[PDB]
Every structure is written in structure tokens, then in C-alpha cells.
UniProtKB/Swiss-Prot annotation, chain A:
Homodimer. Keywords: Amino-acid biosynthesis, Aminotransferase, Cytoplasm, Pyridoxal phosphate, Serine biosynthesis, Transferase. Its main location: cytoplasm. Its cofactor is pyridoxal 5'-phosphate. Binds 1 pyridoxal phosphate per subunit. One of its GO terms (cellular component) is cytoplasm. This is Phosphoserine aminotransferase. It comes from Alkalihalobacillus alcalophilus. Belongs to the class-V pyridoxal-phosphate-dependent aminotransferase family. SerC subfamily.
Amino acid sequence: QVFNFNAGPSALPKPALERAQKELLNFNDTQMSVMELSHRSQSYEEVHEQAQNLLRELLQIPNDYQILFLQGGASLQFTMLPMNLLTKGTIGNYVLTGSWSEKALKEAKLLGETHIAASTKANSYQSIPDFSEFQLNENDAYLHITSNNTIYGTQYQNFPEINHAPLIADMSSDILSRPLKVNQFGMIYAGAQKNLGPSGVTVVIVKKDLLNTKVEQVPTMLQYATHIKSDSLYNTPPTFSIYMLRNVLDWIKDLGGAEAIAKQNEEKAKIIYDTIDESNGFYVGHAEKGSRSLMNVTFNLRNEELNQQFLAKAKEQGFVGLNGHRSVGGCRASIYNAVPIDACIALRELMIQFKENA
Amino acid sequence: QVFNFNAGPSALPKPALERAQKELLNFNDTQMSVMELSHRSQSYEEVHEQAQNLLRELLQIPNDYQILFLQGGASLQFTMLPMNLLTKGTIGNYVLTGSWSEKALKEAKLLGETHIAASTKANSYQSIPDFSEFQLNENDAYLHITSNNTIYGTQYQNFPEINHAPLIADMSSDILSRPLKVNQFGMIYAGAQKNLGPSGVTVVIVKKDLLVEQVPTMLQYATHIKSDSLYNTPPTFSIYMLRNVLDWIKDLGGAEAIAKQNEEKAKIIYDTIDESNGFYVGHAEKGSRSLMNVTFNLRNEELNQQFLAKAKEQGFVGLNGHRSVGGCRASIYNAVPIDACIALRELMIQFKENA
Ligand SMILES: *Cc1c(COP(=O)(O)O)cnc(C)c1O
Ligand SMILES: *Cc1c(COP(=O)(O)O)cnc(C)c1O
Ligand SMILES: [Cl-]
Ligand SMILES: [Cl-]
Ligand SMILES: [Cl-]
Ligand SMILES: [Cl-]
Ligand SMILES: [Mg+2]
Ligand SMILES: [Mg+2]
Ligand SMILES: [Mg+2]
Ligand SMILES: [Mg+2]
Ligand SMILES: [Mg+2]
């Protein structure tokens, strides 16, 4: 028995993988793998377009937004965003809700003026700040948020209404886990490898008229305009990763889309949070209740010996990935879209038995 | 029958793909796909390291070089290189031998002073320039070359001895198609999708001591050197597939063995051109002919199109020349089998006979 709670890359839906396996050598009757095709072939172009069209349908992306498939991870977006929008005289304004927020801010600092609109750093990132706390500037180039703080296990419940500057979000660890009002945002980005399949592609949803203009001085590959104009085919795309993304999106659609996956995600999170909350303090969640993530459940036992013993027992029992991020310790159960509910049931049973036997 | 002459992405070895298929759902008895592993897992780290190790073995890469696995393609390397090495008061010196050389030069021009050491652009990139012609500067940051000019079908036969600045090569379309003396270079880079693997990873071989205040973290070579290409999430499946391809090259006997195969493949196509009494004409001067991309045309555009149509009908994929130049291009990277080249010859001979 294996229970895959990996935090990134992570569990994929089996039908996406079974589909890939079956056609790995002969895709679309071509007698070639999708990995062996030109990105200008009809067979690949169909995949590339269908991945865009599925994202558009599933997230209800408006027609004045474009979907980009880029290399480099979310980490490259931390620099590409300020390179394109943080112009002289303006400010990259950041809401700090975890380590990934900090990493995004650091890159902007290398390129221009920055600001902290709000932060829960002083309290170790246990919550999302109230929107009334946000300190905004008239010359903000953007306001950047991290929707799901993967290391700390906290998540935005809803999103602020920002009118003075575009709202930008790193949605790497919760994109397409629930319905989204895309028109609240100027840009959304996500490495695919948490909730959308493959590592090696980053999905960037951009309001076209904010970013389709040449930016003086910026290298060709680092301009959003390059990728918008070329439909993410300026250079050779990560064709297998985009194919796998397509397959995962087909699965999300098949299961009922964003609304259906939100229902599933709420149920399997509740299995784990109820286990914590019924444990009389034997397990302690990091997040405040009102900010608990549906995607990454972070917790500790009462001391580090017990944390070690629990994690060792989990590994013995077939659980993969439960060690917390190195920077914070404890435990982290990553329960992205494709993690099956019976893995969560199994984790509950492990947690109850370990408590009882301690 | 399908014959895959695609120019990038390209044919992969059947054993590498079959291996990937067999274990796609259960890698190394983990009951997970390699795609479902954490990149901080021992399971993935072993694969990552093995890909590096096989490259090191196969190319005989000295210990004072590091092997990086990056995202962004060779095209991102066109900017990342000058971003790291083209410092104030220095020159990015380029040898132009085709369109890919021009694209690299263009990105350096945005970031600092550039220069053209030598160029065969005036004669439509039919040859590699004589090294004795290179115009070098004391303050060169580097000398950049393109080892195989993928669109023009020309290739360096050997490499210049440069010691005033590091020699840097875009080897996208010929890396690990033959032995190399890596000590001639300060840096080699290649998108994987011609000779090494699927698209989505870029191999960068860099002299460690060669390689920056103000450069974004992801765009510093130092970041990736210090983190062993695990600073952020790597393209795990692409690196796995690279490993599988490298195991296939090793199993057939390594770089000398693949070179012999590639020389035989190329010989079949060039002999067919040369024996055709001018019905097929190669673009490249004989002395510069590529072993990786064979470029040619028929005597007029109507016949070019007729030939390409017939090829497509008979199962050949990818033979249309690059749009910028027209004609035909047979890409015969490592994993393109000799039987496909034989088949292309036989098509070419029949086509001429029926013309
Ligand atoms: C993992 C993650 C990242 C980093 O993504 P890479 O693709 O590894 O660069 C950034 N942001 C968040 C919220 C993440 O979870
Ligand atoms: C294919 C090619 C490139 C472009 O590679 P991308 O991965 O598409 O950026 C660069 N240089 C040469 C010589 C090529 O053949
Ligand atoms: Cl975080
Ligand atoms: Cl993380
Ligand atoms: Cl070229
Ligand atoms: Cl090309
Ligand atoms: Mg369906
Ligand atoms: Mg089950
Ligand atoms: Mg030529
Ligand atoms: Mg072997
Ligand atoms: Mg002869």
C-alpha cells in the first residue's frame, strides 16, 4: 500500500497516466509518441489548443484573457512579473502570507521599489490578513498575493477587490481546486506540478491588454508579449508536459469541473481536520481555523520526538511525502485534487492508531 | 510505415520509450509514476544524478565542469549567457554560421557590446569560416559558436583553440552525436529535444570557475550550480527521459559508436545527392556538411513540392525545409534509425527515376 501525499510534484489522476501509457508510442495514429512530434504538427497543435480550451471552460476564463504555457516554474514568474510591470516610479506591492510570498517579493526587490501591503510573518503565517489591513499605494504597479501558502497550510477564502492596480496571484498550489472569478485578476500563474499534472510547464493566465506590449530592454524570452503574440510557441514548448496537463484537465472536466472538485476537496480536507480537532491536542494544526488550506494540511505533535516517531511510522505504513517542508518541520499532508479520498481515510486511521498507542 | 525526420522535437530511441511506457505507473517499485515523485525524494534524486553521471561518462566531462539541467530551451540560454558573462567593458563575440547564431547574437546586443568574429552570411551560410579569419578582441567576454547550424545543414568539423576568452557553443542539434573534447569550451548548451531527450530540459555544461550582482536568482548560473539544478522544481519527466536516452547511447557503445552510426546515415543521404547528376543539390559546401541535418533542393520549386508531397504520402515526416530557406531538410539525429535513411534514399531514387 502506497499513499501519495507528495507536495510537488504530486499525485496525478490515474486515468490521465493510463491514457498516456497506452498511447506513449503511437499518439493519434501517427506511430510516434507525442514526445517525438513537431510542435507545429496538427496532432500537437490540437493538444496545445485543447489544453487552453479546457482551462478556459473549467475556470470560465473571459475572452480578453490569454492562457500561456511557459517554462521555468513559478519561480521564473517571480522575476518575469516585475521585469514586465515594475516600471520606473512604481511599486511592486506584496501581501506576505508565507515563504513563497517572501520569495516573490525578493525577486521584485532586485528590480525596483517594493512594499508590504500586509503580512502575517510576525505570527509565523498562521492566517490570511484581513483585507482592511492592506496598505495600498497610488503608484502600485500591481498587488501580488499567494492564494495558497503551500509551506504553512493557509489559504485565501476569497479575494480582494482591487481597482487601483492589477491583482496578481501565485496560485501554484490551489489553481483549479475550486471555482474562480478570473476577472478579479490581471494575472494568475501556477507551476503545473501541484494541481494540474506535470512539472515542466507553468500556466499563466493574463489579461491581454495589460501585458501584450513590448517592454524596452527586456530579453525576448522574458517578455510576456513574446509569448502572447506567438501563442506560447515562440520556442519549443514542453510538449509532453502540456499533453499531460491536457489529460489532467480532461479528468477534471469528466468529474464535474471546478464545482465538483471543490466538493471532493472539502470532504477529504474535513477528514483530516476533524482528526486533528478530535485529537485533544495530540495533533495541533499550524493554521488558524478560518485560514485552513484545503490543499496542504500542516500540523505538529506535542514534541519533536513524537513528530519523528509519527513520520517514521507513516513511512513504514506506505505514506509518502508527509514530512513538513524543511524550513518549518512538523508534518504536511498535501491533498491536491488527485489525492484519493481513501488516502485521507488511511491517514486518519494511522493518526488515530498512533495517538491511541502512544 | 512512418519515418520520423522531425527537426526538433524528434525521434527518440524505441528502447527508451518502451522502458518509459512499461514503468509509467510504477517507477522503481514505488507504485508511483516518476511524474508523481517529489523532486526532493531519494527516488527522483537518484534519476537526476544518474542523468548527470551518464552525460559525464559519455562525453568524458572533466571534474572541473558542472552539468546543469535548466528549463527554457536553448533560446533562454541566448540571454542567460550574456546576462552572466557580458559584463561592462567586455564584448560578446559571435561567429555567425546560420540563423541560430544570429538569434543568439541578437539577445546579447540587448545586454552589452557585441562583435562578429567571422561570418558566412554573405554566401548564405554554406560553410564554416576558416579559424584564421576570426577577429578576436582582448576584452572579449567569450567567443560564441553554433556547432551545428540546424537550418543550413552545416557543422563544425573541429573547434578552434581559443585561450583569450572562453569558447561557448550552442550544440543543440549535435550534442553527443560524436566524441567531444570538452576542455576546449567554457560552456556548452543544448535543448534536449534533438539528440538527448524530449523537449522541456536544456543541458548546460559549464566550467565551474567561470560562473553576478543584480541578476535575478533563476537567471544566475551560480544558483543552479550551488543547488545541483534543484533550486526550484526541475522538469522531472524530461530528465528521466534524458536518463533513458543516455542509457541507450551507453548500451550501443557510447559516443564513438553513435558517431559511426551517424556517419553511415549521413553517407546514405549524401551519396544519394552526389550520385543524382544534379537532380538533388545540397546547400552545404562538402567540407562543411552536417551529419545531423541534411539540406537540399530539387531543380525547381514545383519539383521540390512534388517530392515533399510524395514523401509525406509514403510516411516520411518532417522533411520540409525550414520556412526561412525552403527546400528539404532530413534531420538524422542520434535516434533516427539507419533503415529510415535507407528508405529515404530509395524514395529519392524512385522519384528521380519517375521524373
Ligand atoms: C512550489 C511552489 C512554487 C515554486 O514553483 P517552481 O515551479 O518550483 O518554481 C511557487 N509558489 C508556490 C505557492 C508553490 O507552492
Ligand atoms: C532548436 C535550436 C535552438 C532553439 O531551441 P529551443 O529549445 O526551441 O529554444 C537553438 N539553437 C539551435 C542550434 C537549434 O537547433
Ligand atoms: Cl508558503
Ligand atoms: Cl512547497
Ligand atoms: Cl542555422
Ligand atoms: Cl531549426
Ligand atoms: Mg471528457
Ligand atoms: Mg482506492
Ligand atoms: Mg548551407
Ligand atoms: Mg546500460
Ligand atoms: Mg561512393
